[PDB]
């Protein structure tokens, strides 16, 4: 099976009433389907939690991702977390959660506490995890695209069988580095999948510039997003090169009938996979997970001032040693 490339209308698999539109049989067991829904709720609730954190001064910056749940959760499940690599952008905290990154680490980073494995080095919405191959977010718009290409090339040469997925907003597709990076991966037939979380010439059409397949998908459809990205991942994994997948979404918050959660709920419901009771049990479990995560993150403690001189290099050279000694005089 192969989805149609460069379609005029975005690829959909879920009807507005829970019907399956695929031209291939659904092969996700009931448990995995419910798992997708579960993660989407968690991502949504995490996002709403951020709104409170920012409102109550707990954090200085948030990048609302409500509306990206289908796209972000789909990507997390289309790859092997811990094996494949992810080169995310600042709006991917939902993807990070679905990937398995501890809430303690995501929140530790949002609050810049010692719970942040990135040591509060950057502003909020810059998570990163070595454990889950989640390349630490960089502020620039598309600076992480060439690196993703490089990682993929490394996977090809070293025959690891891994894949590197790279996400970005549509604004990023205007940057030269976006083009240069994907072009290199295309030329090398590198196992990289470039995904646009487009808050909607399409972006998929740009794939023509690289001679790689381009896909326009309904980013509010978790199954359409899952299957198209998964196919791209498999293509990459078998050595057939990169793909550009455009997942069209709609951001509710700042930079109703489309909400991906209700749309997928109906799909589960139509198959005896959902009911109000389960819904509440899950939400309750999630809010408990969130409170526990925030607690651990907060009581982790502020990051030490000296840490400002750590990790510039493997070891602190003479000038940094002198600068750290200088700062101390003031502490």
């Amino acid at each position: 099976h192969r989805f149609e490339t460069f379609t005029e209308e975005p690829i959909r698999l879920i009807g507005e009433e829970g019907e399956w539109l695929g031209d291939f049989p659904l092969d996700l067991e009931g448990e995995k389907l419910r798992r997708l829904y579960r993660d989407m709720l968690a991502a949504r609730m995490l996002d709403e939690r951020y709104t409170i954190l920012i409102r109550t001064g707990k954090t200085s910056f948030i990048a609302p991702a409500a509306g990206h749940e289908a796209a972000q959760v789909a990507i997390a499940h289309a790859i092997r977390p811990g094996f494949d690599w992810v080169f995310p952008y600042y709006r991917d905290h939902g993807l990070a959660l679905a990937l398995g990154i501890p809430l303690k680490e995501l929140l530790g980073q949002m609050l810049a506490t010692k719970a942040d494995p990135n040591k509060g080095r950057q502003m909020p919405e810059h998570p990163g995890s070595k454990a889950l191959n989640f390349f630490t977010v960089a502020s620039p718009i598309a600076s992480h695209v060439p690196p993703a290409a490089g990682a993929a090339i490394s996977m090809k040469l070293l025959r690891t069988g891994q894949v590197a997925v790279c996400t970005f907003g549509d604004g990023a597709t205007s940057e030269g580095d976006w083009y240069a990076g994907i072009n290199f991966a295309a030329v090398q037939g590198a196992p990289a999948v470039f995904i646009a979380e487009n808050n909607f010439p399409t972006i998929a059409d740009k794939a023509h510039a690289f001679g790689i397949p381009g896909y326009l998908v309904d980013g509010m459809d978790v199954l359409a997003s899952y299957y198209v990205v998964k196919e791209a991942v498999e293509r990459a994994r078998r050595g057939e090169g990169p793909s550009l997948v455009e997942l069209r979404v709609y951001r509710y918050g700042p930079h109703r009938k489309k909400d991906p959660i209700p749309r997928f709920r109906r799909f589960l419901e139509a198959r005896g996979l959902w009911n109000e009771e389960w819904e509440e049990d899950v939400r309750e479990e999630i809010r408990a997970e969130l409170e526990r995560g925030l607690k651990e993150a907060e009581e982790a403690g502020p990051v030490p001032p000296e840490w400002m001189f750590e990790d510039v290099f493997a070891e602190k050279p003479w000038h940094l040693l002198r600068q750290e000694a200088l700062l101390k005089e003031e502490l």
Binding site: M123, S143, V303, P305, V312, E330
Partner: protein
């Protein structure tokens, strides 16, 4: 009347556009939004999409297109959302903009302005707090200006727009609305390449500009309580910088501390310091001391400490005074 830096900057743009049709503004969200900091607010509504244009999110495209516009017939004022984002457009800035007049034997010129918010003091982390001026100063062909008051903001931005040489205009974001100062509504400009004497003194010279002004001025105030009169010299223009103003002050006081939030190594203040040592060794009563950002990427958590504190500046002043 009294107005913030944002208002003064906005006034300067409005005034220059009303005076010259060729003046156009371009950048990410400079139109409808009026800029992320509101510097260009209301300009679209007043002058139209042919004078204020939103562009794709490409700094190479912004800087490079601005160069093309300037070479052909317009007087573009391009905005880079953050100083940290100048890099994707760095080749355009140094290979095209800076070298156009020189490589063409003067046949082509670049009357354009690239403005950008910079410096820390607001918790910008890695790409919301940088001060990249050294990269520009090191590049022959670019005039560089860093303002610190609403009065200068308007006077110098207007001057940049009239200047035919390319001008990189840095606006410390922490100062965008930190103070409402008197700014004449009448047309006036300030000279590019000239420092401003913020406070006269005879015991110590404090060379500074932009982002760090608040801490340097308060430092001078603390020194005053102890009977030490510090002379505060806001350079304003980093290229070409006010050689005379600097040397006159230093010769007088015999002691100097240079302050900035840009990383220490190969920084602009390092240039001034090396120049003071090379030309006025005989007038120095103490070593030229530099208080700058540390040689590390801009930290989010320790943002408060990276930016020179009043205390850090005083420890350097004390060191220069006791020498």
């Amino acid at each position: 009347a009294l107005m913030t830096m944002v208002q003064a900057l906005n006034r300067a743009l409005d005034e220059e556009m009303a005076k010259d049709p060729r003046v156009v503004v371009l950048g990410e969200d400079v139109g409808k939004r009026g800029g992320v900091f509101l510097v260009t607010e209301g300009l679209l509504q007043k002058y139209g999409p042919d004078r204020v244009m939103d562009t794709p999110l490409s700094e190479a495209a912004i800087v490079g297109a601005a160069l093309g516009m300037a070479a052909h017939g317009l007087r573009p004022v391009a905005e880079i959302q953050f100083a940290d984002y100048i890099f994707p457009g760095f080749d355009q800035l140094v290979s095209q903009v800076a070298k156009l007049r020189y490589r063409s034997g003067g046949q082509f010129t670049a009357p354009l302005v690239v403005r950008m918010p910079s410096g820390g003091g607001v918790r910008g982390g890695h790409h919301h707090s940088q001060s990249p001026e050294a990269h520009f100063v090191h590049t022959a062909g670019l005039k560089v200006v860093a303002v610190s008051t609403p009065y200068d903001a308007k006077g110098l931005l207007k001057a940049a727009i009239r200047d035919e040489d390319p001008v990189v205009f840095l606006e410390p974001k922490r100062l965008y609305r930190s103070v409402k100062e008197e700014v004449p509504e009448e047309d006036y400009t300030l000279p590019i390449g000239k420092a401003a004497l913020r406070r006269e003194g005879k015991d110590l010279t404090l060379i500074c500009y932009g982002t760090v002004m608040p801490e340097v001025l308060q430092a001078a105030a603390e020194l005053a309580k102890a009977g030490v009169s510090a002379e505060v010299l806001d350079l304003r223009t980093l290229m070409p910088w006010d050689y005379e103003a600097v040397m006159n002050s230093v010769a007088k006081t015999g002691r100097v501390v240079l302050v900035s939030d840009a990383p220490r190594h190969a920084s602009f203040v390092s240039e001034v310091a090396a120049t003071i040592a090379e030309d006025l060794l005989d007038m120095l009563l103490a070593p030229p001391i530099r208080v700058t950002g540390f040689d590390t990427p801009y930290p989010y958590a320790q943002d408060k400490l990276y930016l020179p504190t009043v205390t850090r500046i005083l420890n350097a002043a004390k060191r220069a005074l006791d020498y």
